[PDB]
Design a protein around this ligand. Structure first.
Ligand SMILES: Nc1ncnc2c1ncn2[C@@H]1O[C@H](COP(=O)(O)OP(=O)(O)OP(=O)(O)O)[C@@H](O)[C@H]1O
Lengths: 506, 473, 55, 146, 120, 119, 73
C-alpha cells in the first residue's frame, strides 16, 4: 500500500538531506554530444574513470581528460543528454553494489535492479576496475566444480579457480552447458557447508530481453534463484553498458571470492562484449587493428578474466571461476577474437556444430576440447575410472576417417569401433538433467570395461535411466560410498563390477 | 507560440547542419521541419557539434536549400498518425499518406524512438503462435512475439505467402497486419498494393486489415533508417493499446542494415569491419527488442533476409541470426514440384521446435516427419539409380509415407481463390498435429497419393479420397 | 568377373572422391569468406588512415 | 556511324560525356538523359533509355566526393552512392491510363571486375533492379554469341 | 606526336612504354598534396587523368595517329583499377600472361583474353 | 655439415626431403586416397607418416595429459634412430607403434607390446 | 668472421646499419654504400654491391614517413 510511499518519503528525506549539502565542485556545461559520447567544459577536479550524472538521469563515466575539456562516455541512449545541460560529478570511481543481498535479483550494469522486487540490500560498493590478485596469493586449483554433465566431468574437468572457455557456434548449444552447471549446483546450495556451496552469477551481455526473461523463468522453475545473480546488459541498451556489465559482475564475483565462499561466474557471451568495445573504440577515432577490433582488445578480455582464480589459505581460501562464451563464425578457431580468449583461459570445450547437427547434445568435440589444470582437480573416482577414456576416444578418433572406406578390417578395430560408438551414444544428455558424480562414475564404468557390447545401439538411451534406477533401487549403498568417499577402493570396485554384470546380464 | 527558429548553415548531400539561437537546443532524435514550395522537408537531429549547432540526416531530397532558411522545431521525435484510420493507407516515414486518399484523420501522433519494454514486462514463456498454414505450425512454428526469417527471392509466391499470413491472422487470432517495405522497389510496391486490393485484405470501402509503410528506394538514407521504426510504432500502438497479437512484416532487413551503413558513414564515424556501421549491434537491437511479448499483447515479426553474396559469416546476417527465433525458407525446388506454399521442410528450423514448449506429442510428430523426409532425401538418388526393388518393407513404406507427407504439406490458400479457385482451409493446430500423426502411424496408406495434393485437413483428405474413389469407378 | 570387380571398386573410389570434394569445398568456402572479409577490412583501414592525417 | 549505317539515328539521342571531360559532366550525364527520357515518359510514348555504363559514373562520383573531402566508405566510395543510383533508375516507370500510359524503360550496364558480383556497385545495382542479363567470358569463348 | 599530327599531315607512330608509370606518379604525390586517398591506393584523379592522356592520342581528320602503349599490370592482377581503366580506352588489347611464359612459349599472348575491335 | 657432422646433416636432409614429399602429395591424398600413387612414392608416404608419428616425444612436464613418464633422448641415439628408419630397416612395423615414443629401442619395445596385445 | 675464414676481407666493405641503430640509418645506409660503389665506378674499376635486405629499408622508410605525419599510401 502506502508502505513504499513511506520508504520513498524516507528517501525524500535523504534527497532533501543531500540537497542541504549539495555543493558540486565539478559542474560543467555539455559542450558537444556526438558519436554517442559527450565533451564537457569545466570539471577541473575530476578523476579518471569517475562517475558523473547528467541532468536527465543518464549516468556517465569520464574516460579521458584533456587540457581544456573532459570526455565522458555515456551509459545509455544519447537521446536524453542534451547540449548545454548541467553535469554534476558524483565523486566515485565506477562502483557497483556487492554483497549477499543480490541473490535472487536481476540487475543491469550499474546495480539498478530491474526485476521489480524493491531496492538492493547492498552490503557495499566496489570498484569495477580492480587490479587482479598478483601471483603470490594464488594456489593452483585442487577442488572440483561438478558440472553434472557426463562428458564434461569425464573429459574436461573444471577446478574452482580454473578459467575454462565454452567456445562454439551460433544456435549450437552453447548456453545450455552453463545453464546445466548452474542447475547442478543445487546439490550443494541446498546443503549446509559453505565451502561446498557454489554461487552462480550469470552475466548476459548482448542478448535479447526475452531470452533473459526465459532464463530467469528457468532458474525459478528448478529453484536456482536462491543463489543466482543475473547481470543483464541486453542488446537494446547502448554500448558502454555492455562494455561495463561483465566487469561489474566480476566485482560481484570478487566479493564472494575475498569472503571465503566459492562462486562460479558465467560470461555469456564475450564475443558481443568485444562488439561493444569495438563500437566504443571506433567512435573515439581510435584506429582499428586486425579485423577491426581495436588494438587493445586483448587487454580487455585479459583484465576481465584475470580477476578469477583460487586464493590460497593466506587470504581465506575463496575462489572465483569463470566460463566465458565465445560465438565464432562457422566452426572457426582462428579469427582474432577467439584467438585471444583461448590465449587466456585454461582450456576449451569446443562445441562443434556438426555433432549437434547429428543430434548428439551436448556436442563436445572430444579431440579438441582439453583443459590444462583440470586434471589436478577432478573428483578422485572419475580420475580412477576414466584414465583410459580420453585416450580411448583419441583411439576411436584415429579410426574415424579410416572406417569411412567401408573396407573389411581386423578384430581390434571392430571392437574399438563398437565400444567407441557405444561411448559416443552414451555421453548424450537431455536438458536440465545433470548427473551427480556419484552417478557419473557407474555409467562411465559400464562404458569402459566392455559391458555394453552386447546391447544394440538404440537401447543405450534407455539403458542410462534403467541402469540408474537399478542402482537407485537396490545398490543404494554403493552410491552412498561414492558420495562419501569420492574414491573407488578395491572392494568398492569389485562390488561395482558385480552390480554392473548383474544388470548387464539382462 | 514559442518557436525555436534557426538557420540552415550547411547542406552536404543528405547531411544538414542547422544553427540555433542560444539556450534553445533540442536533443538528439528530434524532428525538425523545413517548409518548401513542394511540401515539408523533415530532418532528425543526430549529432550536436556544440556552438548551438546541430547536424541532422535528411528524410527527403535536399536539393535547392538556400542556407539561411528558417528551421522550425517540433520538440518531439518524428510523429506518426496511428490507429484505426491508418489501415489501408500508404504512409511514408514522414507521417503523410501518399495514396492521395486525403489526410489521415488519426487520433494520436506517436514518437518512434520510444523505449523498448522493461525486463519485468517481458513474457516469460514463449508460446506458439497459431499462424494457420500447416507446414509453419507443424515444423517451424512462429514464436508468439518472436522473430522469423523468411528467406528466398521473389517469384516463389512470397507475396502470396505473406497475404496468406494476413488472412489467417485476421481469422484465427483476429490480429491486424502492418507491412513495411524498407528499401522496397517502387514498382513492386505498387504491384503489392494492387494485389492486396484484389485479394480482399485491403478494402477501400470497408475495413481493411493492414497498414502499409513503404519507404521507397529514392529517399535519402536517413529515411530508410527509420521506415522500419515507423512500422514498428504502428505495431506498438496496436499492441499496447487495443491488446492484440499483431504481425509486423518487414522487407527487407538487409536494406535496413544498408541504411544504417550509409547514415553512419555520412556522419563521418569510422567504419567497422566489413563496412557496415560500427553501431551495428545496437542499431539492430533498437529494432529487435521493441518486437516482443508483454502481458497485454504481442507483436510477431516476419522479416525477410537478403543474404549477401550467399554467405553467412557476413555480419549483417550474422547479426540478424542472433535474434531470429525461427526461419522459413521458400526454396526453388519445392515450387518447381508445383507445391503451394513452398515451405521447404528440411531447412526451416525453429528454436521453438522443442517438447518443453510445444508439448511432447507435437515434438514427436515433427521429429518423425523430419527424419522421414530426411530418409526420403537420402534415398532420392538410389530411387533413380536402382528402382523400388532394393527397398525392403522397412524402406518402401517409408518412401510411400514420405510421398504422402510431401503431397500433404501443400494447402489451399485463402488468397488463391482467384488463382486456383479452391477455397482456402484455415487449418487449426489441433487438427494439424492429429492429421500428421495419423499419417505417420499408417492408418491411411491405402489412400492414393493424388488425393493428398492441396488438401486442408484429414477430413477433407477423407472427402477427396471418397470423391476420387467415385471418379475412378 | 574382374571387369565387374574393377568397375565396382572404381565406383566406390569415385564416391569417396565426390564426398571428400564436398567436404573440402565446405572448408575452402569458409576460407574464401574469411579472406574476402579480411581483405575488405584491410583495405578500408588504409583508406580511412589517409582521411585522418590531413592538414 | 554504326547507327547511321543502319539508320537508327532517326529516333536516337546520344548523350556522350566521354572520358576527356571532367568529373561533374560524368556525374550529371545520366540524370540529364533521365530528364530527356522523362520528357517522352510524360507524353504517352515509349522511351528505351540505355545507360552505358554506370561503373564510370560511380568512379566520377567517387572522385568528386573524395576530392570534396566528404568521408569515404566501402572501397572508398562515398556514403550515399546507393542514393545516387536509386535516384536514377527509379525514374523509369510505367504510367497509368489516368496519366497517359507513358513509359520509360531502363537498361543500365555494370562493368564488373574479374567475374564478380560481390563488389559494392554491382551489389547495389542488383539490389535495385529487376535481375540480370548476366554475361560471361567463358561462355563467349565457346562462341555462344551473345 | 600532336605537332607531327596536325601541322604536318602525316602518319604518326607513337610507341609509348610505359603508361602505368604515369598513374603511379600521380599516386606518389597525390598522397602528399592533400587528397584523401581513394581505393586500392591510387589517386582520386584517375579516370579523368587517364582520360586526358588517352584522348589527345587519337586519329583526327588532320592526321593519322597509331598508338602502341605498353601497359604494366601489378602482380598479374587485372582487377586492379589502374590497368582496368585502360581497357575502355584501347582498340586492340593484346593481353600477355605470366602463366603462358611459365610454359616457355614466347611471346606469351593469352589467346583468349586478347580480343580486339577489328575482328568483324 | 662442418658443424654437426656429415652424417647428422645427411639424416636431416633426408628427413626434410621425405616430409616435403608428403606435404607436396598432401592434396592428392586428400582427394582420392593413398591408393593412387606410384610404388616408390607410396612407400615414401608411408615412411613419412611413420616419421611424423615418430617425431612425437612424451614430455617430462606434460606427463598428466598423456599418462606417460618423461623421455629424455640424447642426440646420438636420435641420429642413429632416424638413420635406421630412413634406411628401411623397419618398414613393416605398424605406424601406431611409432607414436609417442622415445628412441628406436622403445619403438621396437612398444611394437612388441602391441604385438603381444593384438596377437 | 666468415669472410675472414675464406679470406675475402682484402676487397670487402661492410656497411652494416644493424637493427640496434636508429631508423634513418636503415633509411640511409644503402645510399651511402651506393656512393661508395660509385667511387669505384667513376674510376674505371668494377664493384659488386649487395644490399641486404630491402624490406628492412622499406620498414625504416615507412617509419620515417609516418612519424613525420605524411599521409601514407
Ligand atoms: N541437452 C539438450 N536437450 C535438449 N535441447 C538442447 C540440449 N542442448 C541444447 N539444446 C538446444 O539448443 C538450442 C540452443 O541452446 P543454446 O542457447 O545453448 O544455444 P546457443 O548457441 O547458446 O544459442 P545462443 O548463442 O543464442 O544463446 C536450444 O533450443 C535447445 O533446445
Amino acid at each position: 500500500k502506502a508502505q513504499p510511499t513511506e520508504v520513498s518519503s524516507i528517501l525524500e528525506e535523504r534527497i532533501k538531506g543531500v540537497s542541504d549539502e549539495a555543493n558540486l565542485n565539478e559542474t560543467g556545461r555539455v559542450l558537444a554530444v556526438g558519436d554517442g559520447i559527450a565533451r564537457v567544459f569545466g570539471l577541473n577536479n575530476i578523476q579518471a574513470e569517475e562517475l558523473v550524472e547528467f541532468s536527465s538521469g543518464v549516468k556517465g563515466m569520464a574516460l579521458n581528460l584533456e587540457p581544456g575539456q573532459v570526455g565522458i562516455v555515456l551509459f545509455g541512449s544519447d537521446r536524453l543528454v542534451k547540449e548545454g545541460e548541467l553535469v554534476k560529478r558524483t565523486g566515485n570511481i565506477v562502483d557497483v553494489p556487492v554483497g549477499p543481498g543480490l541473490l535472487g535479483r536481476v540487475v543491469d550494469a550499474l546495480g539498478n535492479p530491474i526485476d521489480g522486487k524493491g531496492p538492493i540490500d547492498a552490503a557495499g560498493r566496489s570498484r569495477a576496475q580492480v587490479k587482479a590478485p598478483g601471483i603470490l596469493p594464488r594456489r593452483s586449483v585442487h577442488e572440483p566444480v561438478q558440472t553434472g554433465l557426463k562428458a564434461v566431468d569425464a573429459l574436461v574437468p573444471i577446478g574452482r579457480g580454473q578459467r575454462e572457455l565454452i567456445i562454439g557456434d551460433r544456435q549450437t548449444g552453447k548456453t545450455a552447458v552453463a545453464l546445466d552447471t548452474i542447475l547442478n549446483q543445487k546439490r550443494w546450495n541446498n546443503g549446509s557447508d559453505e565451502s561446498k556451496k557454489l554461487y552462480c552469477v550469470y552475466v548476459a551481455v548482448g542478448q535479447k530481453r526475452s531470452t533473459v526473461a526465459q532464463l530467469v523463468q528457468t532458474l525459478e522453475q528448478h529453484d536456482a534463484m536462491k543463489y543466482s545473480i543475473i547481470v543483464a546488459a541486453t542488446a537494446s541498451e547502448a554500448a558502454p553498458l555492455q562494455y561495463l556489465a561483465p566487469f561489474t559482475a566480476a566485482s560481484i564475483g570478487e566479493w564472494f571470492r575475498d569472503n571465503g565462499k566459492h562462486a562460479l561466474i558465467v560470461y555469456d557471451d564475450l564475443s558481443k562484449q568485444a562488439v561493444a568495445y569495438r563500437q566504443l573504440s571506433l567512435l573515439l577515432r581510435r584506429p582499428p587493428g586486425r579485423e577491426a577490433y581495436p588494438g587493445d582488445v586483448f587487454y580487455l578480455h585479459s583484465r576481465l578474466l584475470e580477476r578469477a582464480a583460487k586464493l590460497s589459505e593466506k587470504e581465506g581460501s575463496g575462489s572465483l571461476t569463470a566460463l566465458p562464451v565465445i560465438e565464432t563464425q562457422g566452426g572457426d578457431v582462428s579469427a582474432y577474437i577467439p584467438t585471444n580468449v583461448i590465449s587466456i583461459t585454461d582450456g576449451q570445450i569446443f562445441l562443434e556444430a556438426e555433432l549437434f547437427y547429428k543430434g548428439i547434445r551436448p556436442a563436445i568435440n572430444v579431440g579438441l576440447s582439453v583443459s590444462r589444470v583440470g586434471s589436478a582437480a577432478q573428483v578422485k573416482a572419475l580420475k580412477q575410472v576414466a584414465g583410459s577414456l580420453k585416450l580411448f576416444l583419441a583411439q576411436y578418433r584415429e579410426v574415424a576417417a579410416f572406417a569411412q572406406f567401408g573396407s573389411d578390417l581386423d578384430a581390434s578395430t571392430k571392437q574399438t569401433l563398437v565400444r567407441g560408438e557405444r561411448l559416443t551414444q552414451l555421453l548424450k544428455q537431455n536438458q536440465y538433467s545433470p548427473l551427480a558424480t556419484e552417478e557419473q562414475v557407474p555409467l562411465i564404468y559400464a562404458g569402459v570395461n566392455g559391458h555394453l557390447d552386447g546391447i544394440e545401439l538404440s537401447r543405450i538411451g534407455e539403458f542410462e535411466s534403467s541402469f540408474l534406477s537399478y542402482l537407485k533401487s537396490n545398490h543404494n549403498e554403493l552410491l552412498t560410498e561414492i558420495r562419501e568417499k569420492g574414491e573407488l577402493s578395491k572392494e568398492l570396485l569389485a562390488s561395482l563390477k558385480s552390480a554392473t554384470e548383474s544388470f548387464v546380464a539382462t | 507560440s514559442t518557436p525555436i527558429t534557426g538557420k540552415v548553415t550547411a547542406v552536404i548531400g543528405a547531411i544538414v547542419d542547422v544553427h540555433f539561437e542560444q539556450s534553445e537546443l533540442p536533443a538528439i532524435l528530434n524532428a525538425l521541419e523545413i517548409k518548401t514550395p513542394q511540401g515539408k522537408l523533415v530532418l532528425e537531429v543526430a549529432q550536436h557539434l556544440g556552438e548551438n549547432t546541430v547536424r541532422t540526416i535528411a528524410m527527403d531530397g535536399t536539393e535547392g536549400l538556400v542556407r539561411g532558411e528558417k528551421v522550425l522545431d517540433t520538440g518531439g521525435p518524428i510523429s506518426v498518425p496511428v490507429g484505426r484510420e491508418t489501415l489501408g493507407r500508404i504512409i511514408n516515414v514522414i507521417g503523410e499518406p501518399i495514396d492521395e486518399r486525403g489526410p489521415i484523420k488519426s487520433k494520436l501522433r506517436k514518437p518512434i524512438h520510444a523505449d523498448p519494454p522493461s525486463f519485468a514486462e517481458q513474457s516469460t514463456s514463449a508460446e506458439i503462435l497459431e499462424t494457420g498454414i500447416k507446414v509453419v505450425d507443424l515444423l517451424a512454428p512462429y514464436a508468439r512475439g518472436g522473430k522469423i526469417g523468411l528467406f528466398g527471392g521473389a517469384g516463389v509466391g512470397k507475396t502470396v505467402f505473406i497475404q496468406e499470413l494476413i488472412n489467417n491472422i485476421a481469422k484465427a487470432h483476429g490480429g491486424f497486419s502492418v507491412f513495411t517495405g524498407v528499401g522496397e522497389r517502387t514498382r513492386e510496391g505498387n504491384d503489392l498494393y494492387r494485389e492486396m486490393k484484389e485479394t480482399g485484405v485491403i478494402n477501400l470501402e470497408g475495413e481493411s486489415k493492414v497498414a502499409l509503410v513503404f519507404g521507397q528506394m529514392n529517399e535519402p538514407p536517413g529515411a530508410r533508417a527509420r521506415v522500419a521504426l515507423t512500422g514498428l510504432t504502428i505495431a506498438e500502438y496496436f499492441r499496447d493499446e487495443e491488446g492484440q497479437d499483431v504481425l509486423l512484416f518487414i522487407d527487407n532487413i538487409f536494406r535496413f542494415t544498408q541504411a544504417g551503413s550509409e547514415v553512419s558513414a555520412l556522419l563521418g564515424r569510422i567504419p567497422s569491419a566489413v563496412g557496415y556501421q560500427p553501431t551495428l549491434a545496437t542499431d539492430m537491437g533498437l529494432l529487435q527488442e521493441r518486437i516482443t511479448t508483454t502481458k497485454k499483447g504481442s507483436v510477431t515479426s516476419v522479416q525477410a533476409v537478403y543474404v549477401p553474396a550467399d554467405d553467412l559469416t557476413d555480419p549483417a546476417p550474422a547479426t540478424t541470426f542472433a535474434h531470429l527465433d525461427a526461419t522459413t525458407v521458400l526454396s526453388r525446388g519445392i515450387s518447381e514440384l508445383g507445391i503451394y506454399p513452398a515451405v521447404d521442410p528440411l531447412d526451416s528450423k525453429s528454436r521453438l521446435l522443442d517438447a518443453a514448449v510445444v508439448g511432447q506429442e507435437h515434438y514427436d510428430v515433427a521429429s518423425k516427419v523430419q527424419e522421414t523426409l530426411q530418409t526420403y532425401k537420402s534415398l532420392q538418388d538410389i530411387i533413380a539409380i536402382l528402382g523400388m526393388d532394393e527397398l525392403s518393407e522397412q524402406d518402401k513404406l517409408t518412401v510411400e509415407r514420405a510421398r504422402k507427407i510431401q503431397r500433404f504439406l501443400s494447402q489451399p490458400f485463402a488468397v488463391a481463390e482467384v488463382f486456383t479457385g479452391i477455397p482456402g482451409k484455415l487449418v487449426r493446430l489441433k487438427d494439424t498435429v492429429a492429421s500428421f500423426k495419423a499419417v505417420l502411424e499408417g492408418k491411411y496408406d491405402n489412400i492414393p497419393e493424388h488425393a493428398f495434393y492441396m488438401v486442408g485437413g484429414i477430413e477433407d483428405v477423407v472427402a477427396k479420397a471418397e470423391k476420387l474413389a467415385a471418379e475412378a469407378n | 568377373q574382374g571387369y565387374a570387380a574393377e568397375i565396382s571398386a572404381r565406383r566406390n573410389a569415385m564416391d569417396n572422391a565426390s564426398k571428400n570434394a564436398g567436404d573440402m569445398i565446405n572448408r575452402y568456402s569458409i576460407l574464401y569468406n574469411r579472406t574476402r572479409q579480411a581483405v575488405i577490412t584491410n583495405e578500408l583501414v588504409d583508406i580511412i588512415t589517409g582521411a585522418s592525417s590531413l592538414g
